[PDB]
Amino acid sequence: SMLDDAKARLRKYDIGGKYSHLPYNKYSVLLPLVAKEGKLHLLFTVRSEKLRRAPGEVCFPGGKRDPTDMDDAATALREAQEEVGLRPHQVEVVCCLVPCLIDTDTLITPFVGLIDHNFQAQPNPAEVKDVFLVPLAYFLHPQVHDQINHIFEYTNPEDGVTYQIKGMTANLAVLVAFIILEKKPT
């Protein structure tokens, strides 16, 4: 099936806990995969204008590890629950992708999760201004604008709203699209 095939592909790129004990300032993100209308989609947030870091930017749900978290995957799930109301029974964490080094002292660990079909996002306005889906296939033929650094523009056909996706968030979206969609019969 579509979903069994995606999980099987993702498992080949899992690094597991190989870099998880290194002494960094630690953050995790969840890359949430949603199946709709027979295609895979990624779920994105727009950060609240009130936040200190990156207000109003497009990002994946996530945040800083705390002492309650059993492991780095727990960080991602706790933060996703706080931001968009995703509960544990509604997500299956399939793998841990290559981590992102930033600021000389920080390590960001990305997890891919398969989202239940009955989940409906409940944006927490203290943290998130908006939540939206983008089909995974978009990232193979994106609409690129140069700011020089490359920026993607995605327009939702439901309402005409355009979102700018860039940086680590854009890079990770392309990586997931390549892993899941490369070399597939039609």
Ligand X SMILES: CC[C@H](CO)NC(=O)Nc1ccc(Cl)cc1
Beta bridge partners of 4: none
When the beta carbons of 62 and 142 are compared against ligand X, the nearer one is 62
Instruction: Say if residue 127 carries a ligand binding annotation.
Output: no
Residue among 4 and 103 whose Cβ is closer to ligand X: 103
H or E stretch covering 171: helix 167-181
Smallest distance, ligand X to C-beta of residue 94, A? 21
Least distance in angstroms from the C-beta of 169 to ligand X: 9
Residues in contact with ligand X by CB under 6 A are: 27, 62, 102-103, 106, 108
> Least distance (Å) from ligand X to the CB of residue 113?
17
Distance CA 79, CA 91 (A): 13
The verdict on whether residue 82 carries a ligand-binding annotation is no
Min CB(9)–ligand X separation in Å: 25
CB 93 within 8 A of CB 111: yes
The DSSP result for 36-55, as a single string, is ETTEEEEEEEEE-TT-SSST
Specify the residue, 35 or 168, whose C-beta has the smaller distance to ligand X.
Answer: 168
Among candidates 34, 36, 32, which has minimal Cα distance to 59? 32
Q: Nearest to ligand X by Cβ — which residue?
A: 27
Nearer Cβ to ligand X (52/117): 52
The pairing of strands 106-115 and 25-36 is parallel
Binding-site residues from annotation: 79, 83
